């Protein structure tokens, strides 16, 4: 359970699905939820198992999502305040993905 405040950019699925602006991105051990600020409904709930890749570049964090995702395939790009926050998101989400694959063994 981590929560980050992000700006979802037009780039990729943002434009396509009109998911643009300030969201809270909430992480459990299995899913990531995008909730628009002041909304009482999650706009989209993604399973970690349907994320192909994630990464960052300075103050930007991205998720690429595969063919079985609720959104269909594509990329989300989000802007945060700085590269310390973006690296944190990368490392924490990567950590949850590894915990998920190791739980089988």
């Amino acid at each position: 359970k981590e929560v980050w405040q992000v700006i979802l950019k037009p780039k990729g699925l943002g434009q396509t699905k009109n998911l643009i602006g300030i969201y809270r991105l909430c992480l459990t051990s299995k899913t990531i939820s995008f909730v628009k600020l002041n909304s009482e409904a999650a706009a989209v709930v993604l399973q970690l198992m349907n994320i192909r890749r994630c990464g960052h570049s300075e103050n930007f964090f991205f998720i690429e999502v595969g063919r079985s995702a609720v959104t269909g395939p594509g990329e989300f790009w989000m802007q945060v305040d700085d590269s310390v926050v973006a690296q944190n998101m990368h490392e924490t989400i990567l950590e949850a993905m590894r915990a998920m694959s190791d739980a089988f063994r």
Binding site: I51, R52, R53, G55, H56, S57, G66, H90, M97, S101
Partner: peptide, 9 residues
């Protein structure tokens, strides 16, 4: 860009 593949994909 720094990217990681998801081991649980």
């Amino acid at each position: 860009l720094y990217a990681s593949s998801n081991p649980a994909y």
